[PDB]
Amino acid sequence: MIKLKNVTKTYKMGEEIIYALKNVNLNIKEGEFVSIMGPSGSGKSTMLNIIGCLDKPTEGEVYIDNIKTNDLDDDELTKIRRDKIGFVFQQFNLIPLLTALENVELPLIFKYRGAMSGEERRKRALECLKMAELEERFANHKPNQLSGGQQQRVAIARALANNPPIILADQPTGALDSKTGEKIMQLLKKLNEEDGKTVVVVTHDINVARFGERIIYLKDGEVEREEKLRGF
Amino acid sequence: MIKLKNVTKTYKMGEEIIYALKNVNLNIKEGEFVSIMGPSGSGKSTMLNIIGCLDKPTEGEVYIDNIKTNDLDDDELTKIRRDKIGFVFQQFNLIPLLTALENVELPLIFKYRGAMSGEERRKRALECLKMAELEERFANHKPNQLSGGQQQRVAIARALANNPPIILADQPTGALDSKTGEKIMQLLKKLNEEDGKTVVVVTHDINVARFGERIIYLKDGEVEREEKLR
């Protein structure tokens, strides 16, 4: 479902060439729940961004659902992202002037081909907010009228909106108390197991990582090692 | 050192009233290390913002270093924040066009004690980035050229810059791996014990909270309970 083939991501800082990722190889099967851990700065978000078609590798190849994405243009990558990917940003990236509900309705409307009635919109968006454990009374608040954890739940609800087959979550529980985070992880488990969604979670929380069937550890831009939490 | 007296913070949403904090009472002594925990939305940041003079209570009173902040004008409040408090934001709030180093230096330029030379300012700023465990090689990166955890460390270094007596950290380890977070907590322990700094940390991580002398738990805008540790 997701394949990174000899992926390198570099940045040129002055006269020095920096490696965010260096020759990484990764294959994630359809319906797999994979966790990604590693030191601050090890390359986790760069990896998730590349998998999410939000960034292109400097070298190497990327395949999402068998399609080589690394040579597609801006327009084309957008269609793939919208159809196949639900992305939970670490920084949330909510639109300031839209309410929590409107923020969730965005990717629903961008993906959906026809004309969706306001009633199906509100309804579906609400389902997403409920799955993301955010109380209905907060649906009307703008991002700046919400707490960090409430904002994180809006970010999670938005990733679910387009019912994408792939869910990429960058530290989805970072701003949540352990009880709320646990419900979020149970949601991801349910979508993965019952719905066959491919789930990839970047996290600094071992308890969160343990919901995966594999934990990939990065170190200095490279896959240092892997952990199989299931037999093979 | 910090006192919240019957503090309420309300928001008017339409015709509805929302109590971010409702009649909270809090007394933090000088040199105390206190942790604040509670469910998402319980009122932790509102509390820290009020203590940090970044927001005013709707009702109740606030005292910092024995000074009542309630009716101080904006310049008086800016003055208190600058001398008394080092604030680590949850969202970081770094200036996009300034490098990591420049972001840390900014507070030094507007510290109304005396006047630091350009060399002294830079040197103090590097010391702060080092205490915050950020490698020297990242000092020239702008916020957008840094990872989430690297940005968090710049935010922490900036809070340390004016060597304030009070440090307010809003989930200071949220974007850090446990190893780096542990060093940050060891730094706060060091500044608290060796330097007598008053430290208040809001966190969702119990391991982080356990560095405090006590842990204050919020629930629905109210202090639910307190738990002494040592």
Ligand SMILES: Nc1ncnc2c1ncn2[C@@H]1O[C@H](COP(=O)(O)OP(=O)(O)OP(=O)(O)O)[C@@H](O)[C@H]1O
């Ligand atoms: N401008 C506002 N208008 C309305 N409600 C607000 C506003 N700012 C904050 N709130 C509300 O006050 C309470 C929240 O915030 P605080 O920001 O104090 O939460 P926290 O306790 O810090 O939680 P989190 O762990 O989710 O960051 C929330 O329930 C939130 O919805």
Ligand SMILES: Nc1ncnc2c1ncn2[C@@H]1O[C@H](COP(=O)(O)OP(=O)(O)OP(=O)(O)O)[C@@H](O)[C@H]1O
């Ligand atoms: N635009 C950029 N220019 C230069 N270096 C960059 C840029 N974006 C990211 N990096 C670097 O690539 C590596 C980082 O990021 P990533 O953002 O992939 O880290 P992470 O592994 O997700 O870490 P964190 O836990 O801190 O979030 C870091 O060392 C970082 O400084």
Ligand code: NA
């Ligand atoms: Na990151």
Ligand code: NA
């Ligand atoms: Na908060």
